[PDB]
Design a protein around this motif. Structure first.
Motif, PDB file in Angstrom:
ATOM      1  N   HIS B  24      54.494  28.301  18.221  1.00  0.00           N
ATOM      2  CA  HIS B  24      53.753  27.529  17.232  1.00  0.00           C
ATOM      3  C   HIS B  24      52.467  26.930  17.786  1.00  0.00           C
ATOM      4  O   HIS B  24      51.635  26.462  17.000  1.00  0.00           O
ATOM      5  CB  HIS B  24      54.632  26.410  16.666  1.00  0.00           C
ATOM      6  N   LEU B  25      52.285  26.929  19.107  1.00  0.00           N
ATOM      7  CA  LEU B  25      51.115  26.315  19.720  1.00  0.00           C
ATOM      8  C   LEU B  25      50.075  27.320  20.198  1.00  0.00           C
ATOM      9  O   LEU B  25      48.911  26.942  20.369  1.00  0.00           O
ATOM     10  CB  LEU B  25      51.550  25.450  20.908  1.00  0.00           C
ATOM     11  N   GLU B  27      48.764  29.897  18.606  1.00  0.00           N
ATOM     12  CA  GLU B  27      47.796  30.161  17.548  1.00  0.00           C
ATOM     13  C   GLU B  27      46.697  29.104  17.533  1.00  0.00           C
ATOM     14  O   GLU B  27      46.808  28.067  18.187  1.00  0.00           O
ATOM     15  CB  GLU B  27      48.492  30.208  16.185  1.00  0.00           C
ATOM     16  N   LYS B  30      46.675  19.937  18.039  1.00  0.00           N
ATOM     17  CA  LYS B  30      47.532  20.285  19.167  1.00  0.00           C
ATOM     18  C   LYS B  30      47.654  19.111  20.128  1.00  0.00           C
ATOM     19  O   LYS B  30      48.756  18.757  20.567  1.00  0.00           O
ATOM     20  CB  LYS B  30      46.972  21.512  19.891  1.00  0.00           C
TER      21      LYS B  30
END
Lengths: 37, 45
Positions: B24-25, B27, B30
């Motif tokens: 999920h990180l 892409e 953050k």
């Protein structure tokens, strides 16, 4: 399991959904995003 | 430097343990996720 909530908040942080073309050819296009399509 | 290296190694093994976060990180949000997760669990550097 608190990290689950943090990642959920992160993804929710990102209004109309807009995807991005990630590949295209021969009359077909793949679009990443648009989770509600 | 030693503390930073130990913290980074711990972080790397943790990230390996759960691949969902990496998925999920890969892409600004953050960073905010990072502080909300482990702001104090790791040093400032």
């Amino acid at each position: 399991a608190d990290i689950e909530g943090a990642i959920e908040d992160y993804v929710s942080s990102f209004r109309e959904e807009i995807g991005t073309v990630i590949d295209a050819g021969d009359g077909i296009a793949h679009v990443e995003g648009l989770p509600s399509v | 430097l030693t503390n930073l290296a130990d913290e980074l190694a711990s972080v790397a093994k943790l990230l390996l343990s759960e691949t969902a976060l990496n998925k999920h990180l890969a892409e600004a949000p953050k960073v905010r996720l990072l502080e909300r997760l482990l702001s104090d669990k790791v040093s400032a550097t």
